[PDB]
Design a binder for these strands. Structure first.
Length: 88
DNA sequence: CTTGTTATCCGCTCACAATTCCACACTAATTACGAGCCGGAAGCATAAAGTGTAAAGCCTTTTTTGCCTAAAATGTGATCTAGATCACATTTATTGCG
């Protein structure tokens, strides 16, 4: 059961380490918060990890749902999320 | 007395929101980690036949330039006849009328 939901979980394919890299930076964020009491700035963790600081920000942009289309916005009658995007 | 079909009743699954535009403002949580593995590509220089580009090297043709000068076009001004100019004063000939 940990093999099937290990890849084909979301509606779209998702890598393995891409979801294992999130909780990796989690069990350390509160680790420095329970001691010092301040938010771990992207400077001290840049020396303990293999990620610089710039490219690591674009990684979070990938980790999403992202979002459906047939979802009410304002009119809640005929207006849909995928009905406001112009065509090229 | 027992049996049937029929009528009334209930809860159930079922089908089923319709006055008409716009503006302003606002918004998201969660599956244990570490070591070892094969994967793609970082873009490396290579090298070749093949291709299409990019110097400017004398030829030929066009086009502006300066040229010469033979032949045709161009002022000199004082005198002199054939031309022109105005305004609005007065005189003239047109077709009819009576």
């Amino acid at each position: 059961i940990t093999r099937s939901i290990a890849d084909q979980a979301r509606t779209i394919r998702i890598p393995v380490h891409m979801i294992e890299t999130i909780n990796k930076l989690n069990r350390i964020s509160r680790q420095m918060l329970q001691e010092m009491g301040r938010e771990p700035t992207p400077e001290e963790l840049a020396e303990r990890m293999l990620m610089p600081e710039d490219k690591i920000r674009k990684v979070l942009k990938i980790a999403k749902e992202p979002i459906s289309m047939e979802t009410p916005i304002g009119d809640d009658e005929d207006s849909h999320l995928g009905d406001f995007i112009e065509d090229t």
